[PDB]
Amino acid sequence: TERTLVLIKPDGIERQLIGEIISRIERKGLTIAALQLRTVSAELASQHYAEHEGKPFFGSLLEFITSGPVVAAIVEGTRAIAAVRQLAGGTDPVQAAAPGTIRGDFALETQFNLVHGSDSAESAQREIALWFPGA
Amino acid sequence: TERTLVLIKPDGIERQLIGEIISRIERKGLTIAALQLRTVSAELASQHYAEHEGKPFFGSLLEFITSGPVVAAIVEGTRAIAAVRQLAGGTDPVQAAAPGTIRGDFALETQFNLVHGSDSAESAQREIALWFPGA
Amino acid sequence: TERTLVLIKPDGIERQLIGEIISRIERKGLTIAALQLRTVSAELASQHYAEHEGKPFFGSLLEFITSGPVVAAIVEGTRAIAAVRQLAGGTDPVQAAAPGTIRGDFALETQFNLVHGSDSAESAQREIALWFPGA
Amino acid sequence: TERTLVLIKPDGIERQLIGEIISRIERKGLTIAALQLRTVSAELASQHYAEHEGKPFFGSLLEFITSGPVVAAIVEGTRAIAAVRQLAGGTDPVQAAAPGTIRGDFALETQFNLVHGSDSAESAQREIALWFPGA
Amino acid sequence: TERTLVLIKPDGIERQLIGEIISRIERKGLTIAALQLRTVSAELASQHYAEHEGKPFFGSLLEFITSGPVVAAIVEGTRAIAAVRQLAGGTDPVQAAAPGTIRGDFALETQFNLVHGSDSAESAQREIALWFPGA
Amino acid sequence: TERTLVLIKPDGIERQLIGEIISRIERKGLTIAALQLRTVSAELASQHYAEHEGKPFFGSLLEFITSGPVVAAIVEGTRAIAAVRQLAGGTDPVQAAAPGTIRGDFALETQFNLVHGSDSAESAQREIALWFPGA
């Protein structure tokens, strides 16, 4: 049983999709090991998006993730990392995400694609340690 | 922000899927700018299906779109044309439409595939013109 | 086979509950005989809310029903008038509407209780005539 | 605009109803101000259920609420206290809770009735301070 | 742990509500001990509706219950008899059944109220023995 | 108008997805011609899984389909065989099944992928005769 980090971004909260997103994870057979609504500091924001520090959008990216509260959660279970990714759908909600996925059913633009899931085992360890220090 | 035309065909109405189809459009983040239940003219049917006046089945086509009432609507929003197409699914409900789409979840045959969405920025204007002249 | 008038007020549209509300009517076994999204003129507002002409909130009632578009529909079927009322729930969404009804599941205040259904056969005949002249 | 405490008990978590319960609160128009999955210390459960300090069952009560993790949340909005109670339904899921409520749709016994909502303004203050010290 | 008999009448099957009705029983926490789609003989119909043999609507009752197939099931669990009744709702789908119940959400007339649940323990034993001999 | 066999395996029953799975078949436009909850004997299991007689997993594959009750059904309708397959999704619920399918939305491992549909016309005849002798 692996673990992955799931973030419900500000747009997901503003559109009242917290329960919907969690339900999909629960009915998939995965378990919620940690769940917390909280604000994000620039420090945490910077460290989460470290890999895009040079990129032009980095600026706006940090501004968004700090504009409102987010829901962070540790999802645990068999094939959890890949399962959450399958559930979420590709980055572009119209051209990459299939209908039936979170982004495919509810999103229109890449900027506001509601949720985040760790893209790999290596990535999951880093993200979980970062958001849930000591766990 | 674009606009597209959405038609809920007679089969969609007969199967009581009006609300279901609209809900999917609403939860996707798109807005309903125009909505109307109405009968279709033989005059209007031929103009909407003009690109088939030569083909064989043209007769049965006007017979079906006119056999009962339809719901016409103008869907508006970011990437609306492509989003509605994504939501509806491919023409063949079993071989082309993915599960999770309107056709994939509810239809069996191509003849009765419930809904219609403008295929492009070009036909959207044409179509929105015939069904909603002035808007 | 009676008929009743159903209005999805501006708050219902703003909250994207058009499909949800219609689905509930459809799954109840009733049929949508007429459906139209449209703006409300001050004249129509005044005639629809006639019985409240002399009341403190009459001016607010008119201003709300005119602040945005509404969806008007003619619902038809066995016990339609009483059925739509059952589906909608009492006026006060928290103290009168039971969970499971439209107001019970989605509303908080009486001012913004999303929908309207004719309260009687006499009232239905009057409202149908008023919103769908000739129908 | 009031605040109330909502607890999703161990049985609610074990049955994978976290998202379902939250969705109902969100669609009702209420907002989640605080959300956290956590274990309950017997020390905290004795203070939360301090009402039954003497009563017989009190022992097994702390054993159950302490047997697994719970989800605590601060629900905020107009008539929030009464709204959450309406949504949850009466204590006895079969004889008091109406269908359409959380207990009415998912529970069978009073012991395992899934959720908790503060019953009043004063009860809410006490509970929120207890579960979310300093807030 | 009691048992009760549940019948999904022909109208329930014709309207494609088999899964919906069963889902509600499952999510309530009850278990399906027996499930079978089958036709109803005039003999069995007479025995099932014995209570009404001297009435005017008796013939119509036998004719309807034998007009199509039905789904019979043995539902088992805590307070099963009362729970299934709660779930189904009163006999008159508009005046007695509350929204949120099977009849309240989907039915219009008493004649076609979709489902049946034994009204008591005495009745449960009789009906189960009748539909499921040797169970 | 073809026919196919559908099996809801023990894991599907244990997770209370009977109604959900059937609803998806019903809303797709297919009809349930036969439905039965029953236990499976080693004989039937061996006959059914005959294809994998000498494979390393054949042993446990018989132990599972025999560990609990299953729901067998004959689904009938246009393109029924391919439609049920589309609905169910690929064998691997995470890597092959698309979100929106039964396996995609609810399963994690191939061992416990909830349902079975005949993969071909030839296969359907054999399976139906086997599970529903004389029909």
Short mmCIF file of C-alpha atoms in Angstrom, two decimals, chain E residues 66-123:
data_model
loop_
_atom_site.label_atom_id
_atom_site.label_comp_id
_atom_site.label_asym_id
_atom_site.label_seq_id
_atom_site.Cartn_x
_atom_site.Cartn_y
_atom_site.Cartn_z
CA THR E 66 -49.16 -10.86 -13.37
CA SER E 67 -48.83 -8.52 -16.38
CA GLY E 68 -45.05 -8.58 -16.24
CA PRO E 69 -42.03 -9.93 -14.34
CA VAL E 70 -41.16 -8.82 -10.83
CA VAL E 71 -38.02 -8.85 -8.71
CA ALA E 72 -38.41 -10.61 -5.38
CA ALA E 73 -35.82 -10.28 -2.66
CA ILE E 74 -35.23 -11.17 0.96
CA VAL E 75 -33.74 -8.20 2.78
CA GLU E 76 -31.97 -9.00 6.04
CA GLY E 77 -30.55 -6.90 8.86
CA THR E 78 -31.24 -4.90 12.02
CA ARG E 79 -34.78 -3.44 12.02
CA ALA E 80 -35.09 -4.60 8.40
CA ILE E 81 -38.88 -4.66 8.33
CA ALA E 82 -39.29 -1.10 9.57
CA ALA E 83 -36.26 0.14 7.62
CA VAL E 84 -37.56 -1.06 4.25
CA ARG E 85 -40.94 0.56 5.03
CA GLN E 86 -39.20 3.83 5.91
CA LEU E 87 -37.25 3.64 2.65
CA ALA E 88 -40.31 2.90 0.53
CA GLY E 89 -42.61 5.56 1.95
CA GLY E 90 -46.37 5.61 2.43
CA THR E 91 -48.84 4.08 -0.02
CA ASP E 92 -49.94 7.30 -1.73
CA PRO E 93 -46.74 8.57 -3.44
CA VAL E 94 -47.92 12.20 -3.41
CA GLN E 95 -49.90 12.57 -0.18
CA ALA E 96 -48.31 10.00 2.12
CA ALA E 97 -44.78 9.30 0.89
CA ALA E 98 -42.16 11.88 1.88
CA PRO E 99 -39.67 13.16 -0.70
CA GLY E 100 -36.49 11.16 -0.34
CA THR E 101 -38.35 7.83 -0.24
CA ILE E 102 -38.70 5.53 -3.23
CA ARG E 103 -42.36 6.39 -3.82
CA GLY E 104 -41.85 10.04 -2.98
CA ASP E 105 -39.07 10.52 -5.54
CA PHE E 106 -40.40 8.35 -8.37
CA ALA E 107 -44.13 7.67 -8.14
CA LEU E 108 -47.34 9.55 -8.88
CA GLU E 109 -50.24 7.13 -8.34
CA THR E 110 -51.03 4.54 -5.69
CA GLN E 111 -51.78 1.91 -8.35
CA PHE E 112 -48.21 2.18 -9.64
CA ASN E 113 -46.17 2.71 -6.51
CA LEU E 114 -43.22 0.56 -7.62
CA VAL E 115 -42.31 -1.53 -4.60
CA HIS E 116 -43.63 -3.61 -1.72
CA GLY E 117 -42.28 -4.36 1.73
CA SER E 118 -43.89 -6.60 4.36
CA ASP E 119 -45.87 -4.45 6.80
CA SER E 120 -44.95 -6.52 9.88
CA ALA E 121 -43.15 -9.58 11.28
CA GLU E 122 -46.26 -11.76 10.97
CA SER E 123 -46.59 -10.70 7.34
#
